[PDB]
Amino acid sequence: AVPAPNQQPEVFCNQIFINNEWHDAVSRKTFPTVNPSTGEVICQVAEGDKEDVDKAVKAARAAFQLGSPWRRMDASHRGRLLNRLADLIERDRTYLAALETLDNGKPYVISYLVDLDMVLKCLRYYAGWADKYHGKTIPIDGDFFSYTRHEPVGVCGQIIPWNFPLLMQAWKLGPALATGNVVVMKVAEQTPLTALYVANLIKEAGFPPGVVNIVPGFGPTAGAAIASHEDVDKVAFTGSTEIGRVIQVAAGSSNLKRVTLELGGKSPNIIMSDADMDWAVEQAHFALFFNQGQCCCAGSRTFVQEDIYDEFVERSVARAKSRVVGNPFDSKTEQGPQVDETQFKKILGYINTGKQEGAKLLCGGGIAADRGYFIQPTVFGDVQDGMTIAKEEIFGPVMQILKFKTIEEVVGRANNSTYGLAAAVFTKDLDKANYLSQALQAGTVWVNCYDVFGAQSPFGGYKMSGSGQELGEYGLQAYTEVKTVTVKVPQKNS
Amino acid sequence: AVPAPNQQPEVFCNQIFINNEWHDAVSRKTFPTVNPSTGEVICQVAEGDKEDVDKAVKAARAAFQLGSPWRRMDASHRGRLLNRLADLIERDRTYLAALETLDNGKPYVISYLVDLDMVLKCLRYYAGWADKYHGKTIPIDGDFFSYTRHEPVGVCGQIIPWNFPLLMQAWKLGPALATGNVVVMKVAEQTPLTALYVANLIKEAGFPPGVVNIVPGFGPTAGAAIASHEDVDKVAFTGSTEIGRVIQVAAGSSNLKRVTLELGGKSPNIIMSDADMDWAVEQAHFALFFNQGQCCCAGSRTFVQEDIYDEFVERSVARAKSRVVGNPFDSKTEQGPQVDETQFKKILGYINTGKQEGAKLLCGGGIAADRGYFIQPTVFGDVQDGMTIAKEEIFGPVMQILKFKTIEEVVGRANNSTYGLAAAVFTKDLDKANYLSQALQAGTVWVNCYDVFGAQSPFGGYKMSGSGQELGEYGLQAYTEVKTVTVKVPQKNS
Amino acid sequence: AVPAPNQQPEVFCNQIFINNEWHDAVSRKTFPTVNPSTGEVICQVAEGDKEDVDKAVKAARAAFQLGSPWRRMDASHRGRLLNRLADLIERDRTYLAALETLDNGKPYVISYLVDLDMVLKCLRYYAGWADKYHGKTIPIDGDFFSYTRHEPVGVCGQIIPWNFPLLMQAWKLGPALATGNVVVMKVAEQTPLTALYVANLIKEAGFPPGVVNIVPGFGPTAGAAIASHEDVDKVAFTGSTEIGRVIQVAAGSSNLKRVTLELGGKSPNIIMSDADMDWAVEQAHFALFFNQGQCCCAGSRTFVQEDIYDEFVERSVARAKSRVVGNPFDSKTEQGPQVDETQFKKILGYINTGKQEGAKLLCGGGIAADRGYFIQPTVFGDVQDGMTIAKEEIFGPVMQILKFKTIEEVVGRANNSTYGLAAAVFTKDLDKANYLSQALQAGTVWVNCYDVFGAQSPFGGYKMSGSGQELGEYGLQAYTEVKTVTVKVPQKNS
Amino acid sequence: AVPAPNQQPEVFCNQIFINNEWHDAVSRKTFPTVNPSTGEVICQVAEGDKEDVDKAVKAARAAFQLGSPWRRMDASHRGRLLNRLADLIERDRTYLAALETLDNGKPYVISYLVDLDMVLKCLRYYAGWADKYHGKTIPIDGDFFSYTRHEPVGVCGQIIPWNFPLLMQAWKLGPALATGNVVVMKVAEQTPLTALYVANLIKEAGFPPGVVNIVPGFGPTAGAAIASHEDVDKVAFTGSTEIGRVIQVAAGSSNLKRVTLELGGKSPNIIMSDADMDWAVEQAHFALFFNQGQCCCAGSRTFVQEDIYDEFVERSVARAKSRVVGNPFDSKTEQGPQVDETQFKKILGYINTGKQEGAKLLCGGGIAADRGYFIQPTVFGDVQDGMTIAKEEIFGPVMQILKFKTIEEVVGRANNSTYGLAAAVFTKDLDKANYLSQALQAGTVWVNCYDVFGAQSPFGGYKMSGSGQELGEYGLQAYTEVKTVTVKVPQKNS
């Protein structure tokens, strides 16, 4: 049941949001955001820079000041506000679902039923954490009373990617606002629209000004300015592992601000011989092709037991070949366009490599439309560990199927990586399930499923997949400062 | 590798322990504790009464007075004391292993390698909990500072059975002492020796007088006294499903003191068709025959799938037929005698019942010795739910094997009981394992194992199997009082 | 700013609520519920007995069936529904505020701005706990995977008082429904109306039938039946210190069900010489007189240091003499009538006793109106520890003001009580505030404030003040079953 | 009770510790360690470089290999070893305390009763954590079983400063080893000796080889090697606020490893007029002069209310004049030498700096002995906020006393700092303490005490005092990896 979408929704916000006010870039410069389906320009947006960031950072600090409305306000009320924002976004659910599809290109039915469901659940989840994250009282030695304060970290720099525009915004705002922090958020130049409108609903929710500031622009400028700002207490970056090094390097060189990173991966989806064929075939397909393959934890490495390899591939190629590519607003469409031309050509260049590298091209491999950034659902067979496509994150509709024999083999090959964001195991065996979920060096291991995220379930990565987690209770840690207060008492008793 | 035991351990203690001092029964009355292997008197024991109990409560009450050494005592020092006690106990491990065997009858190997092993770990485990059970600080509405204190409940009465004299003493003292309570313990008339000697080590450990008081005697008097005393803040009793209520009523009529209970069961052992036969066979035998059948969580109902019944049964009979019964001090001895004659004829009585009821006796079924309380390992086959041996806890080396076809059937038959202390499933299938562990109404579900107890692993029970928990972090709850302190402050800030 | 009250609200529910269906008593018997403002009979109400409780429990048990909608419901969905209930309550806030006044007598202004406010926040608070109450994974010894399940406890009997009809029901339902339990609630005969109407909203919110069953009636009939029921897993009773015991034996003598008690007290309010007169006096007045003095934790023992005693006493009388008593619906009315004649004659009888005992009657001491159950704000001075009025909870608008000299002294006298529900200390000294806050044997200690409850803050009592606590995260414990699942794994690694 | 020390303790360890083996530098290079009391060379010590570090890292990685002794080791057993290690350290308490003063310069009496006491307390505390850091089970939406695993981070690099050689080592090893990590530790060129001797005990303790590896040497070499190594999973650096920056970038450019920082401070000690003068003055002296001024959290900023300033100043200057400087092995000595010549000149330059700035030198201000790096207890008065001595951490026995008027004023002046490690308030008023403990922007606030550290008490910092904390349960956060495991289940039920 998905409400009919407005295929050309009108855009109301396209500037810089500061102190619950809409501003032009200081420079007066703007950038265009494009429809990835047509290549056409949707509209112009304010191009924020250092001076816009400072303005935003000045607004946040003063809103984070002791005695300020936001700082004094009940922890319970912060959650009421978060619930309100949830209420209003739901009110604007059909519109936002269409605008997200318009700028990002993901099919509307997904935008409505998945992305916007997940946004509502995440904000409502964190509303419930607002007054339920407690510090401790500590039975310290001697005649002393010791307790801890879990205060907000402060002015939080937040940079999010384009693959899940709205839900990334929610994943960040949730714990930061539930914990009493203020935010200056940097949104992706490819998909800044839905976040700019939500800032409107942030305003409509009742949130005081300066608590959430969004500065649209470009990474190296706005993004870098935040990463370098001397009055920013923490920066959360989600995006290319390349810029990540940039963020951490600038961060130590600015003020030693608190830095958490959530980068890419090359997630292994391991199908053991005793797996349910039909189910593993469909979850494997979803695992890689979901969101036009542009998922942090896409199952881009399909290991299949040799005894079943041929059948699995067969069904996967059949499955892949049936995937409907086209208008995201068309109910039948399973896959919309790639986010942008650069990414578009990047994936094509990967496929090209895969071919020359010797991987067996079984289907797709080229452009799926003369218009927009469409790429055919591509499946490579007989993929090797050394192949470029089997090592580098493609972030596209390119499926990699590797052949293995034993469980000891797949663990080492799966774990032989610089990444460790996610992984999955398909098997009926209890000991196989447990062996693997323990042995795989991943921040998330799915068993007989894939891409199952819960508002209560954390999402963190290992190795070069970064640090820190998202969702669940763990999220509140990186947005909180712990203060210990140890008071001298007349005489301690148990 | 077990050190040669003293088959004739000398007993140093047989009096009443109050305020780190040994007292004579106020009545001057004593009773004999007897070796279940020979049936002769070990020694005379002070027979505590109400008058001795009152002494103990008064001694305890004073040790818990605000400002006392124990109450002013550092939380971490509390752990050192239990850790010291552990260290003292290890020093006397060989001595204590002999004494427990002498009074209880369990093989010296098990006493040394199992029972005492878990005593050290329980005490060492809870020693680490002493200063790590935190209170909270709560982001309450209004300009207030709210935090909780986890205070000791106060004077705690503890009644423990005879099947695990030392381990039970440790399960109870573990959470009690680490969390700062004081204790008046009543030990089993059948097995008082090891507990009395341990009180002595507590003396040497450095525990302030009154902190632990032990009053040997019988239930209706001593036990009743603790249960009825109007200055007893808590009473922890483990044992008969019958007497437990007496506690709930006797205490619920006195001063509404805290009562948690850990009572008997009829725990079902479910063997699925795809389980490892050899493993299942040896585990099922252990699950029921462990500690001469004298276990609360004995797998007293072995459910076996039709497809594997015959082979499982055959394998079961030989294993039991091979089980070595005799002098507990014999290295080769697998099973000692029942704790006393009352138990011995009682179990004899049950075996008889099955025979009449039509259960197929497959082995054992009679007395294995003309001296001591030895009973033959016995196996009943083709057992049906409605039989008495399938309904009442036998607490002896009598095995019940039931046959089933579907998992939905065994779920219902397994759950159709007044008990719910534990349960087990043996299977290689993941989905069965998850299904059964969830569907089963038991406090503890073992999968592909049995009697797997962790000091860190909690021990609770459903229905009439008792309330409250033992072991793990959950144990400290029942021995802690939560006091909320709410403070007015100038101006509340996040 | 309170909306105009409807002094004669219509009654829409007055029967027995089972399976979201309205039923008459099996016997078809009914009882009258009275307006304490006129004494006149408001309406007739179904008189539930054992037979009706059998009905409800059978509906509850079936609602708790494994595979049932309530059992299968997303934990997050349980939270959505509690939020739905609060929303519908908010829509009917003015109505419920008026029916609560008519049935109970409490001032309309208080019912609206306090009672239903706290009702709404409590429900919204626990809605957020719904999917945040986690079990643990345990690093147990050996090659095992051990974790716990925090399952619902099951069929929960809830017997609630009349002093906070709506808040009490919300206080019980919140955590219970949040942990996935099903409820059979016994409401006060004096106050059945507002809770029955909520029953309508429970149905309207979307709760599956049989998840909540409310059987209004009388204690010895309805109440005892619940307390003795063999298929009830837990009984939560709140009220009379006398009746509480009936519960503990009835349940301990029934099926070993889990039993929580919430009984009265005689909470000491300690005012030190260096306290703020203005603040202390106004709080000391509030502490006892709130809700017509019918609060379990009312500060019925006012200790005032000798140096400030007289000035305080003088001011307290003036304050109470000025307290406006009358029509609860009048904005200027400060104190309405007592809940009923039973309570009415009871407290007069207590005033009588206090006179005979030699307590200094300083104001009031009699009837405040010829119609209804109004009693004058009463103040007794020079109260002594041995006096009846200083030992038994009056639950009326009767204030006791005692004299003391040292901080060492008031602690002994304050803790010299059978109860331990609440306490308070008023002072500007840090060491005095900490010293007393620790040494006071009460589940709740207020500093420079009184009756400060946060839904996030637990509410429990010491000694004979009952067990467990209400509100907070500790509130989820009493409605949870801990299941331990320990699984054998190929090879354990850190 | 202090045992007389060995004033010329023998050195038994002086090389590089890898896999429980003592090795020479690859280069065979050594460096001399100096006695800061005599200025003479104590002995030669192996000078590790990149190559020696690479060896240690591989040996660390090897001990962390899945299926290794340390990885298979029971969490509770991990605790036995830490408890064992502490035991061995206690046994060598007098020797290690002598060596620390010899190498560090702090008074033996303090080394013995403070540092080594604290070292023991840290180890035994974290021993009890080993098996108490639980993961959680999470009520995720859908038919799934979701849980998280808290695995070790891996190879943990630890660079420690010289002011608390043994205590700093413990603070790092404790949490690291309790959670199952392996260590490659860099000890200070000034104070490598006692840390090396412990390595010997670690072996006698029984830790599997490679679990802890200690590399003596220099910062630009060993430290930089560790921070840049591609196989070190996390780097924790403690020391110079300047160097702290170098680590974060090298780590950002190396392998994006986890980096926690603990830098310098300029902690404000705020004395209110109503504080206890005598207590305040002796604590204020201690707050700064402890450990020859060489504490990151030194009360280097003493704010005194104008009404009591003159007397406080009067009292503090005398107190310092009476402070004994000399041979740390002489019991009467309160203050030994600074750690070295670098530190020695640094403090002289700072004392000169304040002199030039116009700060009133009230006592000391020069060299205190011709031999070794002894410096006169120095007290500056009428210090202004803009002065360098009021802004930069001197890390010497140099006291700065500032004057203030109101509580709101000192709050802004105190918080106006790049540091936020600690703070303290002296007052008898409840509202002032609570107001200030909340408003002070510090990782740790003391009330009426200073330098009160408990193993159970977390130790972190605000602003440019670094990230992450030490001690408490919060100390384990940095040494833990969170893995979420999400399993498809037949049908989820509560």
mmCIF file of C-alpha atoms in Angstrom, chain D residues 290-426:
data_model
loop_
_atom_site.group_PDB
_atom_site.id
_atom_site.type_symbol
_atom_site.label_atom_id
_atom_site.label_comp_id
_atom_site.label_asym_id
_atom_site.label_seq_id
_atom_site.Cartn_x
_atom_site.Cartn_y
_atom_site.Cartn_z
ATOM 1 C CA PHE D 290 51.730 16.573 44.953
ATOM 2 C CA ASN D 291 54.276 14.589 42.939
ATOM 3 C CA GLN D 292 56.663 17.536 42.649
ATOM 4 C CA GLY D 293 53.887 19.331 40.774
ATOM 5 C CA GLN D 294 54.034 16.619 38.106
ATOM 6 C CA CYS D 295 50.376 15.626 37.811
ATOM 7 C CA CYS D 296 48.234 16.360 34.734
ATOM 8 C CA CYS D 297 45.373 17.370 37.035
ATOM 9 C CA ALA D 298 47.414 19.603 39.321
ATOM 10 C CA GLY D 299 45.377 22.363 40.971
ATOM 11 C CA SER D 300 47.557 24.856 39.102
ATOM 12 C CA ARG D 301 44.874 27.535 39.392
ATOM 13 C CA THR D 302 43.810 28.340 42.955
ATOM 14 C CA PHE D 303 40.806 30.661 42.930
ATOM 15 C CA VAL D 304 40.100 32.212 46.335
ATOM 16 C CA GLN D 305 37.160 34.418 47.297
ATOM 17 C CA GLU D 306 38.273 37.969 48.082
ATOM 18 C CA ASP D 307 36.966 37.891 51.660
ATOM 19 C CA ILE D 308 39.362 35.116 52.714
ATOM 20 C CA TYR D 309 42.143 35.674 50.183
ATOM 21 C CA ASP D 310 44.695 37.463 52.374
ATOM 22 C CA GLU D 311 44.588 34.758 55.049
ATOM 23 C CA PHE D 312 44.587 31.898 52.544
ATOM 24 C CA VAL D 313 47.593 33.425 50.794
ATOM 25 C CA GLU D 314 49.170 33.926 54.207
ATOM 26 C CA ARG D 315 48.558 30.302 55.140
ATOM 27 C CA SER D 316 49.609 28.785 51.812
ATOM 28 C CA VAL D 317 52.909 30.643 51.549
ATOM 29 C CA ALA D 318 53.955 29.490 55.007
ATOM 30 C CA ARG D 319 52.839 25.935 54.269
ATOM 31 C CA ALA D 320 55.138 25.897 51.247
ATOM 32 C CA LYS D 321 58.021 27.503 53.144
ATOM 33 C CA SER D 322 57.771 24.579 55.556
ATOM 34 C CA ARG D 323 57.642 22.080 52.692
ATOM 35 C CA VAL D 324 60.707 19.834 52.942
ATOM 36 C CA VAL D 325 62.888 19.392 49.850
ATOM 37 C CA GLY D 326 65.630 16.768 49.618
ATOM 38 C CA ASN D 327 66.617 13.119 49.333
ATOM 39 C CA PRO D 328 63.331 11.347 48.591
ATOM 40 C CA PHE D 329 64.640 8.380 50.593
ATOM 41 C CA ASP D 330 64.703 10.534 53.741
ATOM 42 C CA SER D 331 61.369 9.991 55.470
ATOM 43 C CA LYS D 332 61.095 13.690 56.355
ATOM 44 C CA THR D 333 61.257 14.682 52.692
ATOM 45 C CA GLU D 334 58.012 15.962 51.183
ATOM 46 C CA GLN D 335 59.388 16.835 47.764
ATOM 47 C CA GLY D 336 62.060 15.127 45.685
ATOM 48 C CA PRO D 337 63.578 16.505 42.483
ATOM 49 C CA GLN D 338 61.843 17.150 39.174
ATOM 50 C CA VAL D 339 62.158 14.119 36.858
ATOM 51 C CA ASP D 340 65.044 15.500 34.776
ATOM 52 C CA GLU D 341 67.054 18.404 33.351
ATOM 53 C CA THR D 342 64.572 19.124 30.566
ATOM 54 C CA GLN D 343 61.800 19.480 33.134
ATOM 55 C CA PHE D 344 64.292 21.239 35.392
ATOM 56 C CA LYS D 345 65.053 24.084 32.984
ATOM 57 C CA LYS D 346 61.422 24.257 31.880
ATOM 58 C CA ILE D 347 60.192 25.169 35.360
ATOM 59 C CA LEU D 348 62.935 27.736 35.920
ATOM 60 C CA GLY D 349 61.868 29.404 32.681
ATOM 61 C CA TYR D 350 58.239 29.446 33.805
ATOM 62 C CA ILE D 351 59.165 30.894 37.198
ATOM 63 C CA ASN D 352 61.100 33.589 35.368
ATOM 64 C CA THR D 353 58.118 34.021 33.052
ATOM 65 C CA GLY D 354 55.719 34.826 35.894
ATOM 66 C CA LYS D 355 58.349 37.129 37.414
ATOM 67 C CA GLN D 356 58.422 39.106 34.170
ATOM 68 C CA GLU D 357 54.627 39.018 33.821
ATOM 69 C CA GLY D 358 54.155 40.972 37.049
ATOM 70 C CA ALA D 359 52.937 38.113 39.228
ATOM 71 C CA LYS D 360 53.807 38.559 42.908
ATOM 72 C CA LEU D 361 56.405 35.985 43.928
ATOM 73 C CA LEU D 362 55.616 35.232 47.571
ATOM 74 C CA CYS D 363 58.134 32.454 48.175
ATOM 75 C CA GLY D 364 60.708 30.156 46.572
ATOM 76 C CA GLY D 365 61.332 30.761 42.882
ATOM 77 C CA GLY D 366 64.798 29.269 42.460
ATOM 78 C CA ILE D 367 66.944 26.137 42.600
ATOM 79 C CA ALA D 368 66.793 24.224 45.892
ATOM 80 C CA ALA D 369 69.931 22.051 45.692
ATOM 81 C CA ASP D 370 73.309 22.026 43.931
ATOM 82 C CA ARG D 371 72.889 18.360 43.098
ATOM 83 C CA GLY D 372 69.978 16.870 41.187
ATOM 84 C CA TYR D 373 66.999 18.803 39.837
ATOM 85 C CA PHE D 374 65.522 20.128 43.080
ATOM 86 C CA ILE D 375 63.390 23.257 42.869
ATOM 87 C CA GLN D 376 62.047 25.532 45.591
ATOM 88 C CA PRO D 377 58.323 25.324 46.344
ATOM 89 C CA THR D 378 57.243 28.526 44.644
ATOM 90 C CA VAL D 379 54.128 30.605 45.201
ATOM 91 C CA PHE D 380 52.791 33.328 42.925
ATOM 92 C CA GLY D 381 50.022 35.653 44.113
ATOM 93 C CA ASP D 382 47.671 38.183 42.503
ATOM 94 C CA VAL D 383 47.882 36.122 39.320
ATOM 95 C CA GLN D 384 45.791 37.342 36.390
ATOM 96 C CA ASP D 385 43.902 35.163 33.910
ATOM 97 C CA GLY D 386 45.907 36.540 30.975
ATOM 98 C CA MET D 387 49.226 35.476 32.502
ATOM 99 C CA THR D 388 51.078 32.542 30.923
ATOM 100 C CA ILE D 389 51.551 30.908 34.315
ATOM 101 C CA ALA D 390 47.758 31.066 34.578
ATOM 102 C CA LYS D 391 47.314 29.590 31.103
ATOM 103 C CA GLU D 392 50.151 27.099 30.541
ATOM 104 C CA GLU D 393 50.815 23.966 32.584
ATOM 105 C CA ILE D 394 54.204 24.266 34.303
ATOM 106 C CA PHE D 395 54.196 20.755 35.772
ATOM 107 C CA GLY D 396 56.413 21.978 38.626
ATOM 108 C CA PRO D 397 56.042 23.031 42.269
ATOM 109 C CA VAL D 398 54.736 26.448 41.220
ATOM 110 C CA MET D 399 51.513 27.755 42.729
ATOM 111 C CA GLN D 400 49.338 30.451 41.159
ATOM 112 C CA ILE D 401 46.735 32.067 43.408
ATOM 113 C CA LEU D 402 43.932 34.088 41.840
ATOM 114 C CA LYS D 403 41.357 36.351 43.486
ATOM 115 C CA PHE D 404 37.639 36.461 42.689
ATOM 116 C CA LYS D 405 34.409 38.012 43.926
ATOM 117 C CA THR D 406 31.331 36.043 42.858
ATOM 118 C CA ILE D 407 30.478 32.414 42.108
ATOM 119 C CA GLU D 408 29.085 33.279 38.681
ATOM 120 C CA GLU D 409 32.303 35.129 37.849
ATOM 121 C CA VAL D 410 34.788 32.420 38.840
ATOM 122 C CA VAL D 411 32.743 29.905 36.825
ATOM 123 C CA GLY D 412 33.446 31.754 33.577
ATOM 124 C CA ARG D 413 37.089 32.436 34.457
ATOM 125 C CA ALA D 414 37.657 28.839 35.537
ATOM 126 C CA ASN D 415 36.050 27.371 32.416
ATOM 127 C CA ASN D 416 37.939 29.791 30.179
ATOM 128 C CA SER D 417 40.620 27.248 29.317
ATOM 129 C CA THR D 418 41.779 24.862 26.616
ATOM 130 C CA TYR D 419 41.926 22.263 29.381
ATOM 131 C CA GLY D 420 39.077 20.427 31.092
ATOM 132 C CA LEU D 421 40.686 17.526 32.910
ATOM 133 C CA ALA D 422 39.740 18.311 36.494
ATOM 134 C CA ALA D 423 38.337 20.939 38.846
ATOM 135 C CA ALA D 424 37.547 21.289 42.533
ATOM 136 C CA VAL D 425 35.301 23.293 44.828
ATOM 137 C CA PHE D 426 35.587 23.988 48.551
#
